């Protein structure tokens, strides 16, 4: 009963080939030139979560060998064991033999190598270059400080830039062609801004919004549907809260904040992010306003990250904003 439609939109729309990977054009073009010319150096993909590293490496493994890549490619992910003994036995044996299936250079894909111990990386530091004419190494990472400098220097560094807006619009258009659905321009822009580079959250919230229409073939996903599905504060309510905090007095500002955060069940952690994102564009006529505005708000965010209270932190944010916006006058 397991069909292709039984997958979440995060994995249902996984790029099969390199042509279906958008955004990282500068890396994909050179990777295609690498595989066409025949010299594939040791690759180190470094990128934020949800950019296309693993999808690109699987598409490359498919395009290099064929439609059966897991047969001859060795893939070590964070789910497997990657101790020093593993590097000594398994990886070193796979690197020093020929292929059972085809006749070509083997490919060792070390996914999430930042989770490797320093001893394992030190042991791999020599085996990655002792067997070079037979096997190649691909190291995927999100944090480039866990990798030792020695291992980091032996691999061609490719940084996966976060998905730009155009690529995400292209992928949304592709999905809306592959799925009977309609998306408003303003709702699409709101989704772009909410994505924050992450390509998986786009598809996740897109499926979640397609699930809350009661008819997905005629009704279009409006901005209200997108803002309600994730519980994020709409820019209108955000601007109203900011204006009430800045201009109005304490009682009415507190009342407005409470009435806005209780009309849709918002969260202070999202209101703070929206407020700082909309406030970083102001033309503060000094350097000490921004200092307090950032310090106090970051302290409040760190305290919220521990779930202390919910009504004291709102008044804390209000007082912090007001006290910060006092050096201007």
């Amino acid at each position: 009963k397991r069909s292709k439609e039984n997958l979440p939109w995060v994995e249902k729309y996984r790029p099969e080939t390199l042509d279906e990977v958008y955004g990282q054009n500068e890396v994909i073009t050179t990777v295609r030139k690498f595989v066409d010319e025949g010299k594939l150096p040791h690759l180190l993909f470094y990128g934020p979560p949800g950019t296309g590293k693993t999808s690109t490496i699987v598409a490359l493994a498919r395009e290099i060998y064929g439609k059966n890549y897991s047969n001859m490619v060795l893939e070590l992910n964070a789910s497997d064991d990657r101790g020093i003994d593993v590097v000594r036995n398994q990886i070193k044996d796979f690197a020093s033999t020929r292929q059972i299936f085809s006749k070509g250079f083997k490919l060792i894909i070390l996914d999430e190598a930042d989770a490797m111990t320093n001893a394992a990386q030190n042991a791999l530091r020599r085996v990655i270059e002792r067997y070079t004419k037979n096997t190649r190494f691909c190291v995927l990472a999100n944090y480039a400080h866990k990798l030792t400098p020695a291992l980091l220097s032996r691999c061609t560094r490719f940084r996966f830039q976060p998905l730009p807006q155009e690529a995400i619009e292209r992928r949304i258009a592709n999905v809306l062609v592959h799925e009977k659905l309609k998306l408003s321009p303003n709702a699409e822009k709101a989704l772009i801004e909410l994505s924050n580079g992450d390509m998986r959250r786009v598809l996740n919230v897109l499926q979640s919004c397609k699930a809350t229409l009661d008819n997905p073939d005629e009704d279009e996903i409006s901005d209200d549907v997108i803002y309600e599905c994730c519980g994020a504060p709409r820019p209108s309510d955000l601007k109203a809260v900011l204006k009430s905090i800045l201009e109005d007095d304490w009682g009415t500002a507190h009342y407005t904040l409470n009435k806005v955060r209780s009309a849709k069940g918002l969260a202070l952690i999202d209101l703070i992010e929206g407020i700082v994102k909309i406030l970083e564009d102001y033309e503060l006529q000094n350097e000490e306003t921004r200092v307090h505005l950032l310090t106090k708000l970051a302290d409040i965010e760190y305290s919220i990250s521990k779930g202390g209270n919910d009504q004291i932190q709102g008044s804390a944010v209000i007082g912090a904003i007001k006290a910060s916006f006092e050096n201007e006058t």
Binding site: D93, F94, I100
Partner: protein, 256 residues
């Protein structure tokens, strides 16, 4: 539905003990011809392939071709829980679910019905054993095991060389070096001790000793092991069973 009732009990035990510490996850493909299975190493260097026809089973009934994947450790755990005097019955429903192993004693009514939850393996079935080997040979399993576990003490790599009517096993290490040179000869009063060789081109290629030490463990099944070697091809170490065959495809080391 699938019903496979063996003639004895320890037959499947000896069949599974071949890959005890050699491979972990296997996928038995059961058809009307018999049970065929293959499993790739954790390091993807050696591939085990076992075929058992309807000759070893007491009763065999397979309606449609089924594929049951399972881990070998749990399979050995289930198999050790059965006495060697009962009968073993592999039972599978219409859709592939947890395989049912059945132990029935022949004198007292003792029904041991174990269920093994199947593993979902990416069964990427290839097409092997269809390639021409430039050299083939066959020799007793005891002599091969002796040579392997005697040369394994001097090094970790073993170079096999098939030349004009001569087989050579060379072990080059640190404490020294060893070389065993055998020649094809066929005895008539003892046909089982004969060493046969058919070569078309000279062959020289190396293998690891850690994998040969696990391959020679299959010598408990048969007494005459066959070895097929070819350049740019895996080495075929085949043990012939009374009903099928168990073959290891070993990947040769890359020399500089």
């Amino acid at each position: 539905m699938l019903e496979a009732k063996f003639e004895e009990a320890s037959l499947f035990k000896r069949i599974i003990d071949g890959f005890k510490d050699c491979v972990q996850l296997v996928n038995f493909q059961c058809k009307e011809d018999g049970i065929i299975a293959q499993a790739v190493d954790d390091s993807r260097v050696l591939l085990v392939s076992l075929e058992i026809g309807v000759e070893a089973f007491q009763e065999y009934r397979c309606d449609h071709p089924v594929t049951l994947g399972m881990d070998l450790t749990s399979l050995s755990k289930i198999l050790r829980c059965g006495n060697n005097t009962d009968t073993l019955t592999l039972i599978a429903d219409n859709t592939p679910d947890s395989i049912i192993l059945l132990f029935e004693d022949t004198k007292k009514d003792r029904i041991a019905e174990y269920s093994l939850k199947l593993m979902d393996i990416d069964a990427d079935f290839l097409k092997i054993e269809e390639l021409q080997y430039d050299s083939t040979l066959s020799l007793p399993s005891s002599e091969f095991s002796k040579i392997v576990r005697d040369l394994s003490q001097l090094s970790d790599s073993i170079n096999i060389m098939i030349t004009k009517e001569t087989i050579k096993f060379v072990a080059d290490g640190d404490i020294g070096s060893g070389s065993v040179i055998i020649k094809p000869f066929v005895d008539m009063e003892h046909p089982e001790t004969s060493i046969k060789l058919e070569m078309d081109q000279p062959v020289d290629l190396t293998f690891g000793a850690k994998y040969l030490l696990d391959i020679i463990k299959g010598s408990s099944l048969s007494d005459r092991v066959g070895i097929r070697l070819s350049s740019e091809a895996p080495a075929l170490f085949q043990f012939d069973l009374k009903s099928g065959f168990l073959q290891f495809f070993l990947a040769p080391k890359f020399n500089d």
